[PDB]
Structure 1
Amino acid sequence: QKTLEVWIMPNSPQPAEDFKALVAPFEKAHGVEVKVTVLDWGVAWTKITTAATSGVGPDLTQLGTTWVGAISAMGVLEPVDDVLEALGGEKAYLPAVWRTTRLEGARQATAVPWFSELRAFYYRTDALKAAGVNPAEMFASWQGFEAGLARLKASSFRDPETKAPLAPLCTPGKNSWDVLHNAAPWIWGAGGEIVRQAGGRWQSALNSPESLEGLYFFLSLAQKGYVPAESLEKNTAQIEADFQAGKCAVFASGPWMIQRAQVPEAKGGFAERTAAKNLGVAPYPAGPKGRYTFFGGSNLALFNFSKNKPLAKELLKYLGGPEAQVRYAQMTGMLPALRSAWSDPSFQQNPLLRTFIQAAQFGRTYPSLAGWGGVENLAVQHLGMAWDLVAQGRLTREALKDLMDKASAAINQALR
């Protein structure tokens, strides 16, 4: 009785049940049972690295694209060049999705692209209308973005449900990997980066002039009262919930919210809510050095201590392939990792998703480095402490620089 075990993060409103629906046609063809376990994003790094060093865990795990090099360099993943060749090799993926299949500079791929995800701004159509904000100008530039938040702060608009005003902007300040992913575009927009390569060695560029200019611009949005104090102690899920509840006019997120907007509360969505009926999407605004957003998603890896590798490689080919690529993106509201799958009507004929599709031009990835998991832990801890400077009214350019100096020294040790 052939059995496979898969670890996933919560990609859909009913994560286990949807994934069971996705693999149902593969279970039927092979007479295999695919058992699924769901790990919260917060604990996923801990549980996946523990499986890696202990030698016990699933056949397959979901991996964030930014983690693939890091888990690969622990030497615990199976080569999957065979699976990727069978899915159509380098040509079948965006160059950026292809780079997340391997540790940077490795002979062999160690992960199969599963779904893509990039970031854009959800806004309340009713709130921006009542505030006199033209979205096309609010989302064009840093100048316009600040100008829209300031109109939204001063607006008399109140939510038809809460009978309370809306925070112009909510973003997470603690615990989530997004504390890093929400800062990345502001950093890139000012011409900076998280890391840079000098003499073949990567190092922190979080304390570079350009990185500090973008981070400072982002944090100073909270300084001016556009992000409420309470938001800076919250994690991604809580900010999502506050947008859904109609407490926030604007927030950065992935294409999945479009799907949740169509599905009732009882099935893990917010179709009942005022926000679901007053939903707009806009790209990140251009910085001084132009337009960028975070491009990520999740791949699938096979642990090299798996006992079911030929069968697990069949599951990878199936999950990586057109039918399952379309189906899971429909269930999750993600984009397919397989580029050919973007032409399916559920993505092309989806108006809010169109913004996410167009935003792929300006999408940017972290290099796929060995220490990258420790970089995200240190960046999240130290960016958390940078939001604290605003909550304490201690935000200065020199206090940010000091903070990022400490982060950079730590990130330089982690990168080796």
Structure 2
Amino acid sequence: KTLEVWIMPNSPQPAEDFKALVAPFEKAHGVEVKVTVLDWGVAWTKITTAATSGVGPDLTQLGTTWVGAISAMGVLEPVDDVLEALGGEKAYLPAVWRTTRLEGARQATAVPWFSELRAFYYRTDALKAAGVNPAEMFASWQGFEAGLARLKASSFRDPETKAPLAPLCTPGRTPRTLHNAAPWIWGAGGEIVRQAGGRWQSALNSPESLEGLYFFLSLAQKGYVPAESLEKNTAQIEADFQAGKCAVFASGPWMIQRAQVPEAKGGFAERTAAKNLGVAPYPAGPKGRYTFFGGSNLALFNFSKNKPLAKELLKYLGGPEAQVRYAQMTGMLPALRSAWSDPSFQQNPLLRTFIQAAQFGRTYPSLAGWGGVENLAVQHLGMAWDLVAQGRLTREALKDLMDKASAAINQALR
């Protein structure tokens, strides 16, 4: 007898780690769990085709930002029962509980699986040399800039490469998401969409949203991000950091894990970067301190022929023991608030910085149309990055691009 589960690649050998995780459940319930791994790049299409066709697995992983769109299709089984058995609303951060439903829905359609948020990895060796105090560089936008300026000047060189380091690496290729940009929007007092006057509307062209975007994009334009980083995507920037080309880059907690895995195992423990690794939160902007808070949930399709067994599996995967074990293999944080006290999270000084940074975690609203909003936003942001590649991103050029993005988002939202 067989349960089918789709996941994304959350760990170096993602199917083996998932199968190890569920072996106790399989033994206790007389069932086999067959897992399929979908790359993040294609998972949306396969999940959407499963949703409209009625041909799919019992359970799928969903990125928290996808729950609303899949739930609005009317294909997910209610899971209020599972969430109650896990301890209900009080067992989760509000930012995690919001991702359990479509915004405004009265019924839960996803079970929190793991959480992740974004912070700055830095080279302790590169900053020590450049004379940069990390507590100062990551406190404020002002500090951040002054720190990249000291890093750009530095004669420091990677021992493996023998070359200087880029102060900051961030991808300039049209992004899949706003996860890199949203902290700058939010720190300025901006937002992507805002609910006001009975309706959701774009806020990407607000003065605050434009101030934060322009701060971020202009770092690349003032030589803090080398030309070659503007031509790279998130994956090619991670590789660059691992290989000693970057002093500072923003990512999720999984880099700590990858950094303890040898290069032969899909990791980078033997590189200088892994041996000189610091983590610092996003700096405070003029209007506050925010980072992207994300993660993945698990949903049950309402056409599953195995709903009872699937719900025992969601309860298993959602519960404390499996929450710690899966976080240990993935480098993510558990979804369940209580599981953060595990010594495996509290005795890792880099992970404790992510834990502290979650106070400033901010999530997107769980809207049916969220994918189309982010898609329109990233297409226009990619045009702004192409102006950066020319030295021609002006406050007026950014505003005209974000005015076109707002008109097309406002259009999509009605």
Post-superposition Cα deviations, 1:237-292, rounded to whole Å, max 9, x if no partner, equal 11111111111110001111111111111222110110000000001000001211
C-alpha distance after superposition, 1:118-137 (max 9, x if no partner): 11100000000111111010
SS of match in other structure, 1:202: strand
Give 1:415 shift. 2.5
Per the alignment, in what secondary structure is the counterpart of residue 352 of structure 2?
A: helix
TM-score by length of 2: 0.97
Task: Indicate conservation of the 8 Å contact 1:382/1:403, yes or no.
Answer: yes
Match of 1:372 in 2: 370
Q: For 1:8-87, list aligned pairs within 5 A.
A: 8-87=7-86
Q: Which residue of 2 aligns with 1:202?
A: 200
Q: Deviations over 1:176-206 (max 9, x none)?
A: xxx4011101101000001101222111100
Residue of structure 1 in register with 2:162 after alignment = 163
**C-alpha contact 1:97 1:113 (8 A) present in aligned 2:** yes
| Alignment correspondent of 1:130 | 129
Aligned partner of residue 35 in structure 2, secondary structure: strand
- In 2, Cα distance between the equivalents of 1:77 and 1:414? 24
1:214 to 212, 215, 227: 212
The structure 1 segments of at least 4 consecutive aligned residues displaced by more than 3 Å after TM superposition are: none
3-state SS, counterpart of residue 367 of structure 1: coil
Task: Spell out, residue by residue over 1:89-115, the C-alpha distance to the aligned partner (whole angstroms, 9 max, x if none).
Answer: 101001110010000110100000000
- Deviations along 1:127-151, one digit per CA (max 9) or x if unpaired, are 0011111101000000010011111
Cα separation, 2, equivalents of 1:85 and 1:126: 48
1:27-49 Cα deviation digits (max 9, x unpaired):
11112111111122222222222
Q: How does 1:77-156 map to 2 (within 5 A)?
A: 77-156=76-155
In the TM superposition, what whole-angstrom CA distance separates every residue of 1:191-239 from its partner, at most 9, and x where no partner exists?
Answer: 0001101222111100111000000000000001111222223221111
Counterpart secondary structure, 1:222: helix
Partner of 1:299, secondary structure, is strand
Residues 372 and 415, structure 1, Cα contact 8 Å, conserved in 2: no
Counterpart of 1:51 in 2: which secondary structure? helix
- Give distance in 2, aligned partners of 1:9 and 1:235: 19
For residue 42 of structure 2, give the secondary structure of its aligned residue in structure 1: helix
Question: Retained in 2: the 8 A contact 1:78–1:302?
Answer: yes
- Structure 1: how far apart are the matches of 2:401 and 2:391? 15
Q: Which moved more, 1:49-58 or 1:129-138?
A: 49-58
Which digits, 9 at most, give the CA deviation of each residue in 1:279-331, with x for residues without a partner?
00001000001211111111111111211111111110000001100000000
- CA distance in structure 2 between the partners assigned to 1:155 and 1:360 by the alignment: 32
6-15 vs 86-95, which moves further: 6-15
Q: Distance in 2 between matches of 1:194 and 1:235?
A: 22
Three-state SS of the structure 2 residue aligned to 1:285 is: coil
Q: SS at the partner of 2:248?
A: strand
Q: CA deviation at 1:406?
A: 1.4
What per-residue deviation string (whole Å, max 9, x for no partner) do you get for residues 14-63 of structure 1? 11111111111111111211111112222222222222122222111111
- Structure 1 window deviating more from structure 2 (259-268 vs 89-98): it is 259-268
- SS of the equivalent of 2:167 reads strand
Aligned to 1:395: 393
Which stretch of the first structure deviates more once superposed, 83-92 or 7-16? 7-16
What's 1:276 paired with? 274
Structure 1 unmatched ranges of 5 or more: none
SS in 1 for 2:178: helix
C-alpha separation in 2, matches of 1:28 and 1:385: 53
For 1:253 and 1:354, the matched residues in 2 are separated by: 15
What RMSD, in angstroms, separates the aligned Cα atoms of the two structures?
1.1
- Output the CA distance in 1 between the equivalents of 2:376 and 2:45: 14
Say which SS state the counterpart of residue 246 (structure 1) adopts. coil
Shift of 1:165: 1.2
Count residues with an aligned counterpart: 411
Q: Distance in 2 between matches of 1:402 and 1:56?
A: 43
> Which secondary structure state, in structure 2, belongs to the residue aligned with residue 304 of structure 1?
coil
SS across alignment from 1:169: coil
Identity of aligned residues (%): 100
Residue-by-residue CA offset, 1:333-354 (whole Å, 9 max, x unaligned):
1000000101110011110011
Deviation per CA, 1:50-87: give whole Å up to 9, x if none: 22122222111111111111111111111100110110
- Structure 2 CA distance, aligned partners of 1:275 and 1:53? 45
Q: Which residue, out of 222, 225, 230, partners 1:224? A: 222
Contact 1:119/1:252 (8 A) holds in 2? yes
Q: Is the 8 A contact 1:13 1:267 kept in 2?
A: yes
Contact 1:45 1:373 in 2 (8 A): no
